[PDB]
């Protein structure tokens, strides 16, 4: 569980996020993709995508990096009462879009770099590991619901 003073630091870098959310969700998901192929393969939309400059220049790419993070912050909002903006969310990834646990794993770390890179007055390492058990408390509920479901990572 987080206390309100991690709450507050994951949630005043995440109001700096919202400054520019579609430049945050081109560099966290082409960081995704660059650091673990694998990712990239699970998007039918993407995989065409083999450069760094041409993921940069995707707007489709961008356009579906504002629709992660917008669901994301949703999440973060809720201070741990998540549950109706996971269902769903943990629902298409375990049984439609097939992404194993680690793989959003991966994706909060992609997360955690690009955070850092564009808030270090406002993301010291109080702030990363605040952020980091936001992520986690995440990343433990849909695994939860993976389980339940028979998927796994
Ligand atoms: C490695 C792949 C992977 C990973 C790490 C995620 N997803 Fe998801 N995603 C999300 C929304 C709102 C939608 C319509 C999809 C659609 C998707 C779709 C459907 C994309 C489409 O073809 O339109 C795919 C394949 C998918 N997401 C792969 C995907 C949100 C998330 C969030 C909040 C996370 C974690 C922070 C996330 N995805 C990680």
Redesign the pocket.
């Known amino acids: 569980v987080l206390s309100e003073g991690e709450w507050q630091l994951v949630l005043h870098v995440w109001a700096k996020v919202e400054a520019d959310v579609a430049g945050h969700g081109q560099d966290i998901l082409i960081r995704?993709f660059k650091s673990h192929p694998e990712?990239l393969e699970?998007?039918?939309?993407f995989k065409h995508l083999k450069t760094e400059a041409e993921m940069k220049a995707s707007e489709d790419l961008k356009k579906?990096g504002v629709?992660?993070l917008?669901?994301?912050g949703a999440?973060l909002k809720k201070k741990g009462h998540h549950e109706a903006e996971l269902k769903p969310?943990a629902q298409?990834?375990a049984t439609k879009?097939k992404?194993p646990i680690k793989?959003?794993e991966?994706?909060?770390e992609a997360?955690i770099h690009v955070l850092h890179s564009r808030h270090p007055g406002d993301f010291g390492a109080d702030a990363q590991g605040a952020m980091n058990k936001a992520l986690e408390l995440?990343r433990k509920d849909i695994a939860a619901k993976y389980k339940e479901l028979g998927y796994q990572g």
């Not at 699970?42 to 939309?45: A, G, H, N, T």
């Open positions: 995704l990712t699970k998007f039918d939309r579906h629709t992660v917008t669901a994301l999440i969310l298409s990834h879009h992404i793989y959003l991966f994706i909060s997360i995440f």
